[model samples]
Target: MDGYKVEVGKNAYLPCSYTLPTSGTLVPMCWGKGFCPWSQCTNELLRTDERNVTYQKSSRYQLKGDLNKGDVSLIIKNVTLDDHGTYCCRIQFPGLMNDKKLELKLDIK
Candidate 1:
């Protein structure tokens, strides 16, 4: 919901969820770096081979959520300086495009 102050080598959770639409059609959910939805997007299943090639998160970082319920939270298993920044989560469907950004700050302590 807000910026996270996480220590080095520790885990950080960036939760992003959306409500299912009445149509029941699956909407593609993506979480990625930067403010835009297309900024190095990764699927809800932690796969990054689509849309953008050759960019991937560490195996430690993942989406451990219920995709059927629309919970697409990103998990950072070990925080690092490079990992601190504004990350975004997006829900894309026909005639709809919604996204939210959350910042990540590293705790030097």
Candidate 2:
């Protein structure tokens, strides 16, 4: 798990690395914020520019960064107990109909 697990009010890097299949090209990584047993979490699309970040829905939930090249990570700031849940990183490849899933989690102190 790459030494995951962090305390509240601290920043932690939930390292996610994967070698995409050689035959295919890369695409953006789309993350989500819904949950159900076998549910997709089907999150909405996050906006980005260069390397800065912004949040929507009154800044309650936000995500930033490029999806390809191991940068599909999300940064949740000043997290509260409600932030605890499962997150799935969805990587899309050009010309491919499906995306790869890399799931992760967040916990509170």
Task: Name the candidate that leads on TM-score.
Answer: 1
The TM-score that candidate 2 achieves is: 0.55
Model 2: residues >4 Å from true position, as ranges? 1-4, 17-26, 35-41, 45-69, 95-97
Please, what is the TM-score per model? 0.66, 0.55
The most accurate candidate by lDDT is 1
lDDT of 1 at 41: 55
> Residue 39 lDDT in model 2?
29
Pairs clashing within candidate 2: 29-67, 32-43
Q: Rate the local accuracy (lDDT) of all candidates.
A: 0.57, 0.48
Instruction: Residues 1-109, candidate 2: write the lDDT tens digits.
Output: 1224657776534444446454434445445544312423365423322233322343544444443444556665566666566655555543545645666666666
